[PDB]
Design a protein around this ligand. Sequence first.
Ligand code: CLA
Ligand code: CLA
Ligand code: CLA
Ligand code: CLA
Ligand code: CLA
Ligand code: CLA
Ligand code: CLA
Ligand SMILES: CCCCCCCCCCCCCCCC(=O)OC[C@H](COP(=O)(O)OC[C@@H](O)CO)OC(=O)CCCCCCCCCCCCCCC
Ligand SMILES: CC1=C(/C=C/C(C)=C/C=C/C(C)=C/C=C/C=C(C)/C=C/C=C(C)/C=C/C2=C(C)CCCC2(C)C)C(C)(C)CCC1
Ligand SMILES: CC1=C(/C=C/C(C)=C\C=C\C(C)=C\C=C\C=C(C)\C=C\C=C(C)\C=C\C2=C(C)CCCC2(C)C)C(C)(C)CCC1
Lengths: 119, 32, 484, 30, 27, 187
Amino acid sequence: LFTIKEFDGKGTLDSFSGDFLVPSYRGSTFLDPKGRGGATGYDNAIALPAKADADEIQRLNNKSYTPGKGSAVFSVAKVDTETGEIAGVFESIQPSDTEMGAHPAKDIKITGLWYGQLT
Amino acid sequence: EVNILGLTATALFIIIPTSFLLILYVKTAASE
Amino acid sequence: GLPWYRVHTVVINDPGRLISVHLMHTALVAGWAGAMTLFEIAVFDPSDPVLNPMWRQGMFVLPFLTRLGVTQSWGGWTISGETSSNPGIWSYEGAAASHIVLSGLLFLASVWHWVYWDLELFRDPRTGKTALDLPKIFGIHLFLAGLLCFGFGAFHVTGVFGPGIWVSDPYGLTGSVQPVAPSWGAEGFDPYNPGGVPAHHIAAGILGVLAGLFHLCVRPSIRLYFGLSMGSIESVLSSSIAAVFWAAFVVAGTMWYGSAATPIELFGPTRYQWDQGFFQQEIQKRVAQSTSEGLSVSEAWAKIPEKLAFYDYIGNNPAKGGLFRTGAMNSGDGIAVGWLGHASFKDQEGRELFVRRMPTFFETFPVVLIDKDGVVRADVPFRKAESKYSIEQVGVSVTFYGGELNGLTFTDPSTVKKYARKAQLGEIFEFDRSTLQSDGVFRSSPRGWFTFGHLSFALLFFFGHIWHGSRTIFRDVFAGIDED
Amino acid sequence: MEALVYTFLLIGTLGIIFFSIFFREPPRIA
Amino acid sequence: QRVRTVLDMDDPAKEETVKELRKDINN
Amino acid sequence: AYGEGANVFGRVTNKSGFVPYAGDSFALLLPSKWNPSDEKEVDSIVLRYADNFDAVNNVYVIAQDTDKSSIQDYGSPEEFISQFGYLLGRQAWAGQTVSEGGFDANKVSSAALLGVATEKDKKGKTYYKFEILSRTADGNEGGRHQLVKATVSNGKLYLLKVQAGDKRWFKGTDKECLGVLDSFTVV
Ligand code: CLA
Ligand code: CLA
Ligand code: CLA
Ligand code: CLA
Ligand code: CLA
Ligand code: CLA
Ligand code: CLA
Ligand SMILES: CCCCCCCCCCCCCCCC(=O)OC[C@H](COP(=O)(O)OC[C@@H](O)CO)OC(=O)CCCCCCCCCCCCCCC
Ligand SMILES: CC1=C(/C=C/C(C)=C/C=C/C(C)=C/C=C/C=C(C)/C=C/C=C(C)/C=C/C2=C(C)CCCC2(C)C)C(C)(C)CCC1
Ligand SMILES: CC1=C(/C=C/C(C)=C\C=C\C(C)=C\C=C\C=C(C)\C=C\C=C(C)\C=C\C2=C(C)CCCC2(C)C)C(C)(C)CCC1
């Protein structure tokens, strides 16, 4: 989930960085292929009535949707004076999707251009 | 609780050459 | 040449080679009986007769061996939990070896009849051509069948010479091979009365002996002979196949609905016993009788036998497995090792809730806990965002009153929901799923497998009888009418 | 099974030697 | 003992019981 | 049974789609299409009717023994519905989530007030009337409309609560829900 939501920026015009909120990827109302979920779902191996022991806890019991956080660094280039239009570049680091909390997330590096109009 | 890999090996080693030899003997005796 | 679906018609007008191929089939069937018995003895685990019985291990021919008398083996064990006395020659392995020796002897006889087929016994003295006096053969065979039926009913099952048959408790707690006194009244037609089997076999053997004597002494009429084509072997083939799938439908029906010849301790419980609350009602009646007179809870439930609680469990349901869920029932959901107890649920303020049991039609069922009056009071909800029925807000607690869990009360965590989900399947039992690497999905009983195989074979033999009756009534047009 | 396979193989060998003794081809040319 | 309570005891768990399906006219 | 002729040229006996119900010191017009159901969520429920099509469209009244003499003594109607934020159903999920969309942090359900009234019928005792749009994070039925008509006559609080999914509410079940709402008269 490529986000920049709730991001604060501290630093100079040449480079300013900070942290932003990263949501899960899926809401708690999302159901897996077997119908299990968080807020709504099965939270149990419905396919077979003899497998709910302390090995499917990572898949059934946890169902975590705890948000992560990411760090992005920005830079201001090509400023405009007459109408206040800035367009620099950015580099963002943020965790990937943990699906439903089953496996740990990788780190995604996102580089590109950003644009803004100041009033 | 049955060594079925060994059972399969023994059964195939019995069935395949015995059937092969029996087929050869039958086709030899059918046409003298 | 001949088509591949006609190669067996070479022995239609060859009585000697017909006897040869019958002997070959008989040898194959006896050899299968011996080999199957030895396979089931090799894979059988006689350690726990109460909680891991033969029907939980996928045993097929061992219940049929047991039903007519053999109980102990050459290994020194007996299926009843007793340690073996002298087994003699007729143990499980002894019966299997006898079947194997019989198979070899029948194989040799089949070879002899294949080689020596042109016996004068099969030749008609009046005309010189090959013929069979089928009404007389039927009379001889009916006399022998009646003699065998009368002997089996008057000497084996009555115990005057044989061991008897398997008689058990109405709830399948205590059962053993015992002699049975015949029941000559209307109660003898009770399917669950064990006394109706010796009386049936005695009366049917007497009547079969009388009918065999009648067919030995009396020739058929010309009209009936020509109408049924009694001089043809294809007609008796059609009639015999008809009687055979009639008997197959009958044995499938008695298999599925249970009878005195179908013991619970040998073939497993019944889906109608699960649906109709047989073991559950008996367990509740025993608990109520103990609680009303003296013994309180958690000690009255300890009076409940381990076998009855195992019977009251949907995993033992024959109508719960699958077509391709192959193997033993232990391979489905583990080997049962103990009874955790009766999961009793109470509300926060205090009133006993009950988990609605799963019917046989449902692969999965919602977990609900409803009141004594019959009103839903709690559940394991799917949406988990509404109403006043989720477990964590109703506040139900599970107490348990049995073997491993006798006073362990759980109220706060999701263990209550887990025990409720286990309680919708009946009595909660502890299972070992690592010995056989168990699947998790429920398997079928030998009763269910027997019923399925026999009903499928019964319809296939209905088609076979219809085809053969077609062929024996329409022989002139199946061969040729010669432009007329 | 374990002993059943051994018994089957032994009696198969015995049947083969019995057939070789009794139901052999008749000895031609000397 | 209490045939009325045990009938109600098996009332919630299973509605297909013989004890329920027999003599249901009086209830 | 008794023998009587079939209905030919005899018109129709019911077209309003509302059947009267008289209870313990209350009366209300139930929807004719709806049927009774024995599903007491809250134990104070004395009557419950639900739609045969979709049981989310349901109505029930509660008879709660109470202390306050009149409904005005329950304070402001906002203060009243703050007390009755328990018969909506608290969330059974306690995990962290900021991914629901359009909801407060860690929440999967919300309720929006759309009506506050003090209607009167025949004697002078006032009726607290409310409309609530309940939006759940899955969005089932597009939300649910809770219409609440509450009062106390002698010493027992009488609270109508008709429920309607926003899917059915937009189709035209609004007429029947409002009919039940206006027909709940406590006599
Ligand atoms: C009508 C007779 C009958 C019945 C009721 C049973 C019943 C049973 N047998 Mg048994 N068996 C039989 C005959 C029978 N058997 C015969 C004749 C043999 C000799 C070959 C065996 C050999 C045998 C062994 C070795 C074992 C069993 C086992 C079992 C038990 C496990 C369930 C099962 O069978 O798996 C499932 C059954 C099926 C899936 C049936 C197949 C459905 C159709 C017919 C398949 C269609 C065929 C298809 C066209 C072929 C294409 C497939 C191809 C791609 C591979 C069960 C109670 C097991 C056991 O519990 O150990 C004691 C065990 O391991 N049986
Ligand atoms: C068709 C009806 C019928 C059937 C199915 C049975 C079935 C059975 N009877 Mg029985 N019985 C019957 C009629 C029947 N009986 C009648 C009419 C009588 C009165 C005469 C008796 C009197 C009787 C007695 C007194 C006893 C039985 C016993 C038994 C049980 C084991 C013996 C057996 O038959 O193994 C199968 C037998 C065969 C397959 C015969 C094969 C013949 C072989 C090939 C000859 C080879 C020689 C030698 C035995 C080979 C060695 C084998 C091995 C050691 C190498 C078995 C369940 C015994 C028992 O109580 O069980 C413990 C017992 O002691 N029966
Ligand atoms: C000496 C003969 C003999 C003996 C004593 C036994 C004994 C036994 N056999 Mg067996 N068997 C034999 C010969 C014998 N067999 C032969 C020759 C074959 C090859 C066809 C077989 C093939 C065979 C198989 C496949 C199986 C056995 C099995 C068994 C065991 C249990 C039998 C049982 O309960 O099933 C019950 C027997 C019956 C239900 C027979 C009923 C007969 C029907 C109802 C006749 C109805 C039609 C009739 C013509 C009507 C007459 C009219 C009337 C008025 C008279 C038992 C120890 C079972 C076993 O556990 O393996 C070891 C098993 O599955 N046998
Ligand atoms: C399938 C054939 C069949 C056979 C061979 C028998 C044989 C027998 N039955 Mg039975 N019966 C049958 C079918 C059969 N029944 C059926 C289908 C039913 C209904 C479920 C009954 C209900 C029945 C009852 C209630 C009783 C018997 C009794 C008897 C025994 C003495 C009756 C008698 O003949 O004395 C002489 C008969 C009379 C003096 C008058 C006849 C009235 C009796 C009470 C009814 C029984 C008639 C019976 C059907 C006759 C069968 C004919 C057979 C003997 C050739 C006898 C051995 C009696 C018994 O238990 O023995 C102690 C007994 O009380 N039977
Ligand atoms: C007084 C002596 C006596 C006694 C006590 C008995 C006692 C008994 N006999 Mg019996 N009988 C006797 C004499 C006696 N008989 C005599 C002298 C004869 C003539 C030889 C018979 C012939 C006979 C037959 C043919 C049968 C019995 C059966 C029975 C049993 C019936 C109960 C049961 O098992 O379930 C109930 C049994 C049935 C409901 C079978 C009824 C037949 C139905 C209509 C078959 C329907 C299937 C058919 C293919 C239709 C197609 C269905 C479609 C969906 C495909 C019972 C214990 C039955 C049996 O073997 O038990 C398993 C049986 O079929 N007896
Ligand atoms: C005991 C019952 C029985 C018996 C004795 C016979 C006997 C015969 N049948 Mg018949 N049939 C039967 C039942 C029986 N059938 C049933 C139940 C059906 C319905 C499926 C049929 C349908 C049928 C047809 C359509 C035809 C025959 C034909 C024939 C005749 C010779 C053809 C032949 O078999 O070549 C050899 C057969 C084969 C090589 C088949 C290949 C093997 C199959 C595919 C698999 C075998 C399964 C397994 C190995 C055995 C287990 C089955 C067992 C458990 C039941 C022969 C006299 C033919 C005929 O009318 O004669 C001109 C003919 O066309 N039958
Ligand atoms: C699809 C049904 C059907 C058809 C078309 C046939 C057709 C045929 N059968 Mg056949 N049969 C059937 C079913 C059928 N059968 C069943 C279910 C059985 C019992 C297993 C038999 C047993 C049988 C035998 C033993 C024989 C035949 C034979 C024959 C052939 C000779 C003509 C004849 O007598 O027919 C049969 C006549 C009928 C099927 C009429 C049945 C009418 C019934 C009895 C009315 C009873 C109703 C009564 C109120 C009971 C209802 C109570 C209810 C609750 C159950 C013929 C081609 C003969 C043959 O050798 O083939 C050449 C032969 O001997 N059949
Ligand atoms: C373990 C013990 C032993 C195991 C048993 C082994 C069994 C061996 C034989 C079994 C196989 C039999 C071979 C049949 C050989 C065979 O079929 O031969 C074709 C045969 C035609 O026979 P004829 O009339 O030409 O006979 C004259 C001779 O030349 C043939 O013998 O057809 C039939 O007999 C039945 C008619 C339809 C049958 C064919 C149609 C099948 C449908 C296939 C559909 C495919 C596409 C489906 C897509 C939807
Ligand atoms: C010679 C001799 C002998 C003997 C030997 C032997 C050992 C034999 C055997 C044999 C055997 C051991 C046999 C067995 C068998 C088996 C069988 C016969 C089978 C089968 C099959 C079937 C029939 C199947 C069917 C099917 C299929 C196809 C698949 C699955 C399913 C079903 C079921 C469908 C001795 C030395 C002793 C002495 C004398 C002489
Ligand atoms: C020589 C002779 C002859 C011929 C005969 C015959 C032809 C026979 C046969 C036979 C047969 C036709 C057989 C068959 C069989 C079968 C078997 C023997 C089987 C089996 C079994 C098994 C072991 C299996 C197993 C399994 C299963 C169950 C499943 C899984 C997989 C498997 C496959 C492993 C005649 C009479 C002409 C003349 C005289 C002599």
